[PDB]
Design a protein around this ligand. Structure first.
Ligand SMILES: CCNS(=O)(=O)c1ccc(F)cc1
Length: 145
């Protein structure tokens, strides 16, 4: 397997799947570095975020567990096609980039917080992360370039 990826076993179904411990992505199919990458993200802040405030809420009070539940729900809606990433980012991201559909632009290594950077550079073009934790909160990352 590529680095970052491991085989895993579904607990409910017994079917093999693949999990990436850098991006927290999981998928059924077997998976198959850039100077810069371009990503969008959807951030859900919690009461332990470095700045527990956002354009959505002056005082963010949800627990980290509650933030993760929200992230997990958004991931479900994106993967089912019931909702688009860009739509959910514009509506519900606690980052100011919500107004740009979550787009952060292009960036190099050494600019972003490290778990976010590592996830971004491990994603393939077009691929989306699982929940990624930083001091800002919990992110869904979409690599666009
Ligand atoms: C700075 C220009 N406004 S923005 O909303 O596109 C934005 C906000 C935060 C970012 F980290 C990146 C882009």
């Amino acid at each position: 397997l590529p680095p970052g990826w491991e085989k895993a076993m579904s607990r409910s179904s017994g079917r093999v799947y693949y999990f990436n411990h850098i991006t927290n992505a999981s998928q059924w199919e077997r998976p198959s570095e850039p100077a810069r990458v371009r990503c969008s993200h959807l951030l859900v802040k919690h009461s332990q975020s470095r700045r527990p405030s956002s354009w959505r809420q002056e005082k963010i009070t949800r627990t980290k567990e509650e933030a993760l539940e929200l992230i997990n729900g958004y991931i479900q809606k994106i993967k089912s096609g019931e909702e688009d990433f860009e739509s959910l980012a514009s509506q519900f991201s606690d980052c100011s980039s919500a107004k740009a559909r979550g787009d952060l632009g292009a960036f190099s290594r050494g600019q972003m917080q490290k778990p976010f950077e590592d996830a971004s550079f491990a994603l393939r073009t077009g691929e989306m992360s699982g929940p990624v934790f930083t001091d800002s909160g919990i992110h869904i990352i979409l690599r666009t370039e």
